[PDB]
Amino acid sequence: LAARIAVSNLHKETKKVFSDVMEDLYNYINPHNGKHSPMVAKSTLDIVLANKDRLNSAIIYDRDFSYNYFGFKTLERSYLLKINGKVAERPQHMLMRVSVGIHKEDIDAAIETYNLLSERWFTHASPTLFNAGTNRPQLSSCFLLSMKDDSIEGIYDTLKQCALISKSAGGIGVAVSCIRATGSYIAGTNGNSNGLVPMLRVYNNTARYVDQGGNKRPGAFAIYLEPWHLDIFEFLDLKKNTGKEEQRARDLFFALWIPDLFMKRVETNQDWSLMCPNECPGLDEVWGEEFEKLYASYEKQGRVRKVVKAQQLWYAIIESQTETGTPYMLYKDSCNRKSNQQNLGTIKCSNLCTEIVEYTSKDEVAVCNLASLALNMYVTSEHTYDFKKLAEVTKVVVRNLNKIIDINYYPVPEACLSNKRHRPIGIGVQGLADAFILMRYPFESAEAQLLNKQIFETIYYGALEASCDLAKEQGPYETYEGSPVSKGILQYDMWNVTPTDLWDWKVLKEKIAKYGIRNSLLIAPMPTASTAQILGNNESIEPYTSNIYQIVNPHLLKDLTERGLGSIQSIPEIPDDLKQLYKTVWEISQKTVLKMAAERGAFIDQSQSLNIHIAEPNYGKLTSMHFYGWKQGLKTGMYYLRTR
Amino acid sequence: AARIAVSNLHKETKKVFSDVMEDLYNYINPHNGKHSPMVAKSTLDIVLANKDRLNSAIIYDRDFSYNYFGFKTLERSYLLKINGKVAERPQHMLMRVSVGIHKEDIDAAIETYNLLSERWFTHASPTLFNAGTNRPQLSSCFLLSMKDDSIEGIYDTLKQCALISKSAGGIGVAVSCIRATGSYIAGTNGNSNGLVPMLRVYNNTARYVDQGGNKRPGAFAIYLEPWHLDIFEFLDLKKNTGKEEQRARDLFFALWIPDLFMKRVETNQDWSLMCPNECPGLDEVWGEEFEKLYASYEKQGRVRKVVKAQQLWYAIIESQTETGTPYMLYKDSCNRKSNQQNLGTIKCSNLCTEIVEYTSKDEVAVCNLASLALNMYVTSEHTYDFKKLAEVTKVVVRNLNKIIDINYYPVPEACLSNKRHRPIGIGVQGLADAFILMRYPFESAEAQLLNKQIFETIYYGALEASCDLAKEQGPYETYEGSPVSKGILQYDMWNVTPTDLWDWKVLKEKIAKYGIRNSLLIAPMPTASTAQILGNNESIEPYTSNIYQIVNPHLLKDLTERGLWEEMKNQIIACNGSIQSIPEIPDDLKQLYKTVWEISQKTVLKMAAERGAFIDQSQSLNIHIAEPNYGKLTSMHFYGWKQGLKTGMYYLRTRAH
Ligand SMILES: Nc1ncnc2c1ncn2[C@H]1C[C@H](O)[C@@H](COP(=O)(O)OP(=O)(O)OP(=O)(O)O)O1
Ligand SMILES: Nc1ncnc2c1ncn2[C@H]1C[C@H](O)[C@@H](COP(=O)(O)OP(=O)(O)OP(=O)(O)O)O1
Ligand SMILES: [Mg+2]
Ligand SMILES: [Mg+2]
C-alpha cells in the first residue's frame, strides 16, 4: 500500500550494506559533547567485520517490505537506531544486529536466527530488539521482587531497586504484603504506622519519575497484595479517578495474590479476617493447606485487626474492577501448587503483566527473558498445522533465551543471582486467533479447542527437548535436583491432564530423567502489544480484536475477495460461514476463553496474560467469570478487565 | 489555675525519681507482653547507684514555675507516659535528661539539672525526648548535599532523608548538582525531566516518614542556587494553585544565592540559566572563583536560557508573597565567613536557616542545639549580668560536646561529620523579654548595645569553654588551617572591633596555645516549642503580641504595679495584640511594648548584622511585614544582603501569614 512507499523511502535514506551501517553506529561521535559514544559494542562490530561478506550477503532486503503500515511506523519510531535524529538502520540490519548480538562468534547460529526472525516465525522482546549488540546491554523484560523487610531501610532499599531496574528498561511486580498495616505499633519511634497507602505514593511518584529507558515510556510497577492484609479496602481504591490525592496512586498497577480460602469464604458468605503481617508473620511464606492452617490459627488466637464479611471485600474488588478494570486476579495457591520452582519456597507474586510465576526473596530478584512465536506462520495452504515446524522453531528460541541469560547485564545483582541459579525463560505466542482464522476454525469451535491444546503441547514438548539437550551439553540448572520435573512431574501432570497422542511424552520423560533440563521454567504467554503490531498479528492468545486496525483485516479481505464480495455481524451480504469465523472479542463467550486458557494452561509452566473482555461488566457477570476461572485451575484468572 | 494543673499531676505521679525510672525501664507492653524499656539500663543503673544524691537534689516546687500552656505542652509531648498516663513530672524529665548526658559525673548532672529546672537555658526537644533512653537521637538539624547527579545517588540520598526523618531530624538538602529538564542522559540515550518530578518523590517521602511518634510530618528544606535552569518551576512548587505534577507542597524551599545574582538584579543585567551537567562545579566554588567560573561558562555558550536578572527576581517575590518562601541565604557571605571554609565550599543551610556547615558525599553535617534564656540574666537593678551569661554558656558548650559523643546518628555520614568537626549550635530565646526587663525599647540605641554585648558575651563564653575542652581533649580533627587557627575569630571576618566589655586578647592567647574543640559554636534557632515551655518570646524576635487569653506577664506586671491595670484585655485584643491606641497606658510603656508589626524591619536587619559578627553560624531571621509589596520586599532583601547577613530571611511573615 502506502507501506511500500515508506519502505522504499527508508531504503533511499539509508546505506544498504549491513557492516557499513554498523561501522557508522560504532564510530558515532556525539556532536554536542565531542565524545565518542558508540551505539553498538565494539565486540559485535569486530565479529561482524571478520564475517562481513557472509553476513552482509545473507540479508534479504526485500523482507523490509513484508511489514504493514503501522508495523513499519512502529519500528521507525522506536526499534531502529538513529544517528543524529536520522534513522541509520533498516529493519533487516536491526534483526542481524540482534542476531549477532545474541550469537557472537557463531555465524551459523546467527544466520539461522536472522532468517527465522526476518521471515517472522517468532520475535524477541523489545528490550532485546533495542539493546542486543549494544554496550552493557540489558535484554530482559520482566523483573519480580519481594519487599526486602518490614522496615524504612528495606522499603527504601527496595525502592532504589525499582528505580534502577526501571531505568534499565524493565517492568516490575512487587510483593508488598509484609509491610505492617495502618495503625500498627512501631517500637522504634513509639508511634503508629500509616500503612501502605502513603508508602505506595512514594513508589507511585518513583514510577512517574524514572522512565523505562530513554524513549519516554513511563515506569511500570505492578503492586501485589494478598487480600488478608488490613489495608486491602484502601488499596482497592488507589487507582480510582476520583478522591483526594493523599488516598490515590494512579500511575501504578494493581494485582491481588489470592488464596483459595478467600474464594472459599466468599462463595459460602463466611466471615473474612483482616490482619497485620507484623501481628501475623509469614502468611505470604506458605500456601494452600499450610496457609490455611496458619491463617486459621491466627484467627483462633485473636491476632485479627478487623473481621468483615467476605462478600464485603468481594464487592470492593468488583467495584474497583468496574471503575478501573483493576486489580488483576492471581490464584496464589494454583500458582504455587503447579510451579516447577516450588522446591525454593513460596512464590510471593507475579510480574507486571501477570504471566511470570517465579520465586523471589530478599536477596533474589526474579528476571525473565521473553520471546514470542507467530502461530499464523505455521498454518499450511492445506489448512493443516505444521506442528513439527513449531517444535523446531521453539527449540531455537529456547537456545536463544538461554544464551541471553549469560549475555545480560543485570540492573541489580540479586537479579543476576536469581537468573543464574534457576535459568527460567518465557516463550509466548502471538497470532493464535490468526491461526484459527487461517485454518477456518471459529475460536469457540471444538476444532479451535483441539488446536489450542495441540499448539501448546507442541511448544512445551519442543521447549523441553531443547532444554533437555542444553542440560546434556552444559549440566542442569543449579536448583534442579528436588524439583517436580526432577521427579518426572511435568506441568500437565500437576493439572492431572493427559496429553493427546500428537507427541511421545514417554521418550521425552526418559530423556529428562537421564539428563535433566537447563531451565526451571520455559513457557509464559505475554501481551505482545508492541511486537504483535510490528508483525501484523492479533495480540497473543487473545481472540480476534476486530475486523479493522484506515485498514481492513487482510484475512477477511482475502476471503471476501476469494468469494467475490469493528464487527461484521451487521453486514447481510457476508455469509454466515465467515460471520462465525470473524467474530470479535466482544462477540465471544468469556467462559469459553477461560476453558481454553485452562486447557492450554496444562502445558504452560508459568502463566498467561489473560485479558477478559466484557462490554458492560456488572457484579453478576464478574462474579461468575472469576469463580469459573479459579475453579477451572487458572494461575491468572484475569489480567485486565477490558470494556468499551 | 496552673497551680491546680501541677498538683494534679503530682497526685497522679510517684514523687521519688529513682522509682519512676524503675517503672520506665521495667515497663511491659500490655499488647505484646514484651519488655520494652522506656529508659536505658545504663541510665537506670546509674540512677540507682546514686539515688540518694539525685532523688533529694530534685526540687519539685520548680514544677510550679511553668505557666499554663508551657505546662500543657510538657504534658502533651515531653513527659513520658506508661499506657497514655503521664508518669514523669517535669523535674524527673529534666533529671533524666541530665544523667542521660553526664552519666556517672553526678557533680555535672546536678549542675545541669539545676540550670535547667531554674530555666537558665534549655536543651533542644530531641534531647529532652530521647536523652536517657534506648534510641537516643539527640540532635535536631541535619544537612545533606545530593550524593551524585545519578539515579543511584538520588535514591541513596532519598534513603538518608528517610532514615534521618524517622529519627526525628529536620533536613536541609542541596539539589543544584542534579541535571536539568531537557538534558541528555547518555546511559539510556534519552532526556531528563529535571528537578520537579524528583522533588515529588522527596515530597511524598516527607509525607510518608514522620518525625518521631508525635506524628510530626517529615521536614525537608530544598536548597537551589538561582542559576539552575529549573529555577522558575522550583519557585512554583509550593503554590496552592497548579497541577499536582508541578507541585511539592509539603516540602520547604530556600535559595542559596551568589553575590553575582544580586548584583545583576540591582544593575538590571541579563542572568544566564544553566544545567549542572553542562556546567559542572558551580556549587563547589563561591565568591570570586564562582564568579570566574559562571562567567567563563556564559562566554563558552554553555547556557540553556537567558533571562533578565529582574524577571527571576520578580518570580521570587511573587513566590514569597503567597507562601512566604523561599528562604534567602547569601552563599558567599555564608562561605566567606565560615570557620569551616578550610573544608571546601558549603552548599546549603538547614531546615531553619541558622546552621552553615560543610557537607559532602561522605559527610552529612549535624547540629546539637541549646538555647540561653536571656530574660534570666537581668538583675533586680535593671543591669545585664554578662558574667552569669558567660558562666552558663560554658556549661552548655560542655553539654553539647558530650552529646556529640553519645548521640545515635541515623546515617554513618553524620557520625563521620560530627566527630571530625564537632560543630555545636548555642542559641537564645527571650531577647525581647530581656530588653523589656531592662526597660529598653527594641529599637533604642540602648537595646542595640545590649544586643551586641549579649552576643559578644555568649561567643567569648563559648570559645573559652571550647578552648578549655581543647586543653583537656585535643583540638578537633580539622582545626589546623581553619581561620580560628590563624587567629581569625568571627568578628574579624566582618571587620568589626568588639566593644571593651570582654578581653579578647587574653582569649586569643589561650586559643593560639590550645586551639579549640568545636569548629562552630553559635546559632540562634527558632525555639518555637521551648520558648512556649519556658514562657519567653521566641529566639531573637521582637515582641510578637501583648496577648497570647493571657496578657503578657511583663505588661500585666508593669501596669498593675503603677496601678493602671480588666477591660484593657478586650481593647488590646480588638487592636490585634497592640497597645499603641489604649488611652490609659503611658507613652513610657507604649514604646517598650511595640510589637513586631510596629517595629522597623531595617532596624531588625541592622541588629542581626550586629549580633551577626559574634555568631559563627547564622540566624533564623524572620521578617514581619503586614502588607508586603515589591518595593518593600526588594529594599528589605537588598539591605540585608548588603549588610553582610548570612541568612537574609527565614520566613516572610505578614497579616495573612
Ligand atoms: N517515622 C515513620 N513514619 C511512618 N512509618 C514508619 C516510620 N518509621 C517506621 N515506619 C514503618 C515502616 C515499617 O512498615 C514499620 C517498621 O519500620 P522500622 O524502620 O523497622 O521501625 P523500627 O525498626 O524502629 O521499629 P520495629 O522494631 O517495630 O520495626 O513502621
Ligand atoms: N530513566 C530515567 N528517567 C528519568 N530521569 C533519569 C533517568 N535516568 C537518569 N535520569 C536522570 C537522573 C540524573 O539526574 C541524570 C543521570 O542519571 P544517571 O543514572 O547517572 O544516568 P546515566 O549514568 O545512564 O547517564 P549519564 O552518563 O549521562 O549520567 O538523569
Ligand atoms: Mg524494625
Ligand atoms: Mg551517570
mmCIF file of N, CA, C and O and ligand atoms in Angstrom, chain A residues 149-155 178-181 184-190 192-195 198-199 278, chain B residues 135 162-163 165-168 207-213 216, ligand 1:
data_model
loop_
_atom_site.group_PDB
_atom_site.id
_atom_site.type_symbol
_atom_site.label_atom_id
_atom_site.label_comp_id
_atom_site.label_asym_id
_atom_site.label_seq_id
_atom_site.Cartn_x
_atom_site.Cartn_y
_atom_site.Cartn_z
ATOM 1 N N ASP A 149 12.140 -6.176 53.646
ATOM 2 C CA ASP A 149 11.937 -6.311 55.096
ATOM 3 C C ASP A 149 10.880 -5.292 55.489
ATOM 4 O O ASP A 149 10.709 -4.275 54.793
ATOM 5 N N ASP A 150 10.143 -5.566 56.575
ATOM 6 C CA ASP A 150 9.180 -4.599 57.110
ATOM 7 C C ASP A 150 9.874 -3.485 57.886
ATOM 8 O O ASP A 150 9.817 -3.469 59.130
ATOM 9 N N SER A 151 10.526 -2.572 57.159
ATOM 10 C CA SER A 151 11.373 -1.504 57.752
ATOM 11 C C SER A 151 11.557 -0.325 56.821
ATOM 12 O O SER A 151 11.425 -0.458 55.638
ATOM 13 N N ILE A 152 11.877 0.853 57.347
ATOM 14 C CA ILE A 152 12.129 2.006 56.472
ATOM 15 C C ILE A 152 13.335 1.710 55.590
ATOM 16 O O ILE A 152 13.371 2.087 54.453
ATOM 17 N N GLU A 153 14.318 1.007 56.145
ATOM 18 C CA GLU A 153 15.539 0.639 55.418
ATOM 19 C C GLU A 153 15.225 -0.289 54.267
ATOM 20 O O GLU A 153 15.684 -0.060 53.150
ATOM 21 N N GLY A 154 14.449 -1.350 54.521
ATOM 22 C CA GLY A 154 14.029 -2.245 53.449
ATOM 23 C C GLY A 154 13.115 -1.601 52.407
ATOM 24 O O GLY A 154 13.264 -1.861 51.210
ATOM 25 N N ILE A 155 12.174 -0.772 52.846
ATOM 26 C CA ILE A 155 11.240 -0.090 51.926
ATOM 27 C C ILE A 155 12.030 0.734 50.899
ATOM 28 O O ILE A 155 11.814 0.619 49.695
ATOM 29 N N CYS A 178 4.141 -7.854 53.317
ATOM 30 C CA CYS A 178 4.846 -7.951 54.600
ATOM 31 C C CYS A 178 4.933 -6.593 55.314
ATOM 32 O O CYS A 178 5.292 -6.505 56.488
ATOM 33 N N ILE A 179 4.566 -5.532 54.635
ATOM 34 C CA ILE A 179 4.625 -4.212 55.242
ATOM 35 C C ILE A 179 3.496 -4.023 56.265
ATOM 36 O O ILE A 179 2.339 -4.300 55.967
ATOM 37 N N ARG A 180 3.832 -3.548 57.472
ATOM 38 C CA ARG A 180 2.851 -3.570 58.573
ATOM 39 C C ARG A 180 1.771 -2.489 58.324
ATOM 40 O O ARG A 180 1.990 -1.554 57.550
ATOM 41 N N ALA A 181 0.596 -2.674 58.913
ATOM 42 C CA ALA A 181 -0.630 -2.052 58.391
ATOM 43 C C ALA A 181 -0.967 -0.757 59.081
ATOM 44 O O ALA A 181 -0.399 -0.436 60.115
ATOM 45 N N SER A 184 -0.595 0.081 63.179
ATOM 46 C CA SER A 184 0.245 -0.849 63.939
ATOM 47 C C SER A 184 1.427 -0.180 64.585
ATOM 48 O O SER A 184 2.029 0.775 64.059
ATOM 49 N N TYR A 185 1.787 -0.727 65.733
ATOM 50 C CA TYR A 185 2.749 -0.130 66.623
ATOM 51 C C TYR A 185 4.126 -0.176 65.973
ATOM 52 O O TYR A 185 4.417 -1.127 65.232
ATOM 53 N N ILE A 186 4.929 0.877 66.213
ATOM 54 C CA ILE A 186 6.352 0.903 65.834
ATOM 55 C C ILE A 186 7.204 1.100 67.064
ATOM 56 O O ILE A 186 7.323 2.196 67.549
ATOM 57 N N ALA A 187 7.812 0.029 67.546
ATOM 58 C CA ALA A 187 8.630 0.094 68.739
ATOM 59 C C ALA A 187 9.686 1.196 68.617
ATOM 60 O O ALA A 187 9.923 1.956 69.568
ATOM 61 N N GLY A 188 10.299 1.298 67.442
ATOM 62 C CA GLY A 188 11.433 2.213 67.248
ATOM 63 C C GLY A 188 11.195 3.703 67.437
ATOM 64 O O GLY A 188 12.134 4.446 67.743
ATOM 65 N N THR A 189 9.951 4.139 67.224
ATOM 66 C CA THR A 189 9.555 5.549 67.376
ATOM 67 C C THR A 189 8.359 5.737 68.328
ATOM 68 O O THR A 189 7.801 6.847 68.398
ATOM 69 N N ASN A 190 7.946 4.655 69.008
ATOM 70 C CA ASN A 190 6.772 4.651 69.885
ATOM 71 C C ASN A 190 5.532 5.246 69.181
ATOM 72 O O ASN A 190 4.672 5.922 69.770
ATOM 73 N N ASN A 192 2.720 4.992 65.542
ATOM 74 C CA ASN A 192 1.794 4.159 64.819
ATOM 75 C C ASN A 192 2.010 4.286 63.306
ATOM 76 O O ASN A 192 1.991 5.399 62.784
ATOM 77 N N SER A 193 2.201 3.145 62.623
ATOM 78 C CA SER A 193 2.364 3.097 61.148
ATOM 79 C C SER A 193 1.175 3.740 60.434
ATOM 80 O O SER A 193 0.058 3.725 60.959
ATOM 81 N N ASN A 194 1.410 4.314 59.262
ATOM 82 C CA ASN A 194 0.291 4.774 58.416
ATOM 83 C C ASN A 194 -0.058 3.789 57.298
ATOM 84 O O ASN A 194 -1.013 3.990 56.531
ATOM 85 N N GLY A 195 0.726 2.711 57.249
ATOM 86 C CA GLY A 195 0.446 1.599 56.383
ATOM 87 C C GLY A 195 0.829 1.865 54.947
ATOM 88 O O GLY A 195 1.596 2.777 54.649
ATOM 89 N N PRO A 198 0.435 5.524 51.980
ATOM 90 C CA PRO A 198 1.430 6.561 51.708
ATOM 91 C C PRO A 198 2.758 5.990 51.286
ATOM 92 O O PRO A 198 3.545 6.670 50.613
ATOM 93 N N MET A 199 3.043 4.764 51.674
ATOM 94 C CA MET A 199 4.242 4.144 51.184
ATOM 95 C C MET A 199 4.155 4.035 49.645
ATOM 96 O O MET A 199 5.052 4.407 48.908
ATOM 97 N N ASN A 278 2.840 -7.887 60.734
ATOM 98 C CA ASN A 278 3.623 -7.767 61.945
ATOM 99 C C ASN A 278 2.992 -8.491 63.118
ATOM 100 O O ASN A 278 3.667 -9.189 63.866
ATOM 101 N N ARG B 135 16.854 4.498 72.232
ATOM 102 C CA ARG B 135 17.255 5.088 70.950
ATOM 103 C C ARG B 135 17.408 6.638 71.036
ATOM 104 O O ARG B 135 16.475 7.411 70.708
ATOM 105 N N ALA B 162 15.037 9.644 54.431
ATOM 106 C CA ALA B 162 14.097 8.734 55.089
ATOM 107 C C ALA B 162 14.532 8.355 56.500
ATOM 108 O O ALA B 162 13.760 8.463 57.426
ATOM 109 N N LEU B 163 15.776 7.902 56.640
ATOM 110 C CA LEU B 163 16.266 7.370 57.901
ATOM 111 C C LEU B 163 16.340 8.467 58.919
ATOM 112 O O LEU B 163 16.047 8.258 60.101
ATOM 113 N N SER B 165 14.718 11.503 58.958
ATOM 114 C CA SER B 165 13.422 11.989 59.414
ATOM 115 C C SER B 165 12.806 11.010 60.441
ATOM 116 O O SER B 165 12.258 11.425 61.474
ATOM 117 N N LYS B 166 12.935 9.709 60.194
ATOM 118 C CA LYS B 166 12.404 8.717 61.122
ATOM 119 C C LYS B 166 12.931 8.933 62.520
ATOM 120 O O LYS B 166 12.245 8.661 63.501
ATOM 121 N N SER B 167 14.167 9.401 62.627
ATOM 122 C CA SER B 167 14.802 9.530 63.931
ATOM 123 C C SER B 167 14.677 10.982 64.412
ATOM 124 O O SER B 167 15.450 11.435 65.273
ATOM 125 N N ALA B 168 13.692 11.673 63.814
ATOM 126 C CA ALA B 168 13.179 12.964 64.221
ATOM 127 C C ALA B 168 14.133 14.113 63.923
ATOM 128 O O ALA B 168 14.137 15.129 64.643
ATOM 129 N N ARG B 207 5.960 13.303 53.424
ATOM 130 C CA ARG B 207 4.601 12.948 53.867
ATOM 131 C C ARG B 207 4.600 11.598 54.535
ATOM 132 O O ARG B 207 3.920 11.379 55.531
ATOM 133 N N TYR B 208 5.362 10.678 53.962
ATOM 134 C CA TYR B 208 5.297 9.308 54.424
ATOM 135 C C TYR B 208 5.995 9.145 55.745
ATOM 136 O O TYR B 208 5.391 8.608 56.649
ATOM 137 N N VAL B 209 7.237 9.613 55.868
ATOM 138 C CA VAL B 209 8.090 9.291 57.042
ATOM 139 C C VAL B 209 8.051 10.406 58.070
ATOM 140 O O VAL B 209 8.615 11.466 57.855
ATOM 141 N N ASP B 210 7.394 10.129 59.191
ATOM 142 C CA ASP B 210 7.194 11.084 60.259
ATOM 143 C C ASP B 210 8.464 11.291 61.042
ATOM 144 O O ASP B 210 9.406 10.475 60.997
ATOM 145 N N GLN B 211 8.454 12.379 61.803
ATOM 146 C CA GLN B 211 9.462 12.627 62.831
ATOM 147 C C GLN B 211 8.854 12.109 64.128
ATOM 148 O O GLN B 211 7.783 12.568 64.544
ATOM 149 N N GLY B 212 9.490 11.105 64.728
ATOM 150 C CA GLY B 212 9.023 10.522 65.993
ATOM 151 C C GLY B 212 7.634 9.877 66.020
ATOM 152 O O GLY B 212 7.136 9.372 64.999
ATOM 153 N N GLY B 213 7.042 9.858 67.224
ATOM 154 C CA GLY B 213 5.671 9.393 67.462
ATOM 155 C C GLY B 213 4.731 10.575 67.378
ATOM 156 O O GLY B 213 3.665 10.471 66.771
ATOM 157 N N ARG B 216 4.667 14.225 63.839
ATOM 158 C CA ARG B 216 5.276 15.335 63.079
ATOM 159 C C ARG B 216 5.650 14.927 61.628
ATOM 160 O O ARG B 216 6.463 14.024 61.445
HETATM 161 N N1 LIG C 1 8.706 7.551 61.045
HETATM 162 C C1 LIG C 1 7.872 6.678 60.407
HETATM 163 N N2 LIG C 1 6.798 7.129 59.723
HETATM 164 C C2 LIG C 1 5.986 6.269 59.126
HETATM 165 N N3 LIG C 1 6.212 4.966 59.164
HETATM 166 C C3 LIG C 1 7.261 4.450 59.788
HETATM 167 C C4 LIG C 1 8.112 5.303 60.420
HETATM 168 N N4 LIG C 1 9.063 4.542 60.972
HETATM 169 C C5 LIG C 1 8.827 3.256 60.682
HETATM 170 N N5 LIG C 1 7.728 3.200 59.948
HETATM 171 C C6 LIG C 1 7.128 1.947 59.459
HETATM 172 C C7 LIG C 1 7.950 1.252 58.394
HETATM 173 C C8 LIG C 1 7.635 -0.207 58.655
HETATM 174 O O1 LIG C 1 6.485 -0.551 57.884
HETATM 175 C C9 LIG C 1 7.395 -0.262 60.193
HETATM 176 C C10 LIG C 1 8.745 -0.551 60.931
HETATM 177 O O2 LIG C 1 9.711 0.322 60.453
HETATM 178 P P1 LIG C 1 11.169 0.224 61.152
HETATM 179 O O3 LIG C 1 12.123 1.074 60.404
HETATM 180 O O4 LIG C 1 11.604 -1.305 61.211
HETATM 181 O O5 LIG C 1 10.954 0.727 62.707
HETATM 182 P P2 LIG C 1 11.706 0.118 63.885
HETATM 183 O O6 LIG C 1 12.665 -0.932 63.498
HETATM 184 O O7 LIG C 1 12.414 1.295 64.604
HETATM 185 O O8 LIG C 1 10.642 -0.469 64.926
HETATM 186 P P3 LIG C 1 10.355 -2.076 64.869
HETATM 187 O O9 LIG C 1 11.353 -2.894 65.619
HETATM 188 O O10 LIG C 1 8.870 -2.191 65.346
HETATM 189 O O11 LIG C 1 10.340 -2.459 63.307
HETATM 190 O O12 LIG C 1 6.980 1.044 60.590
#
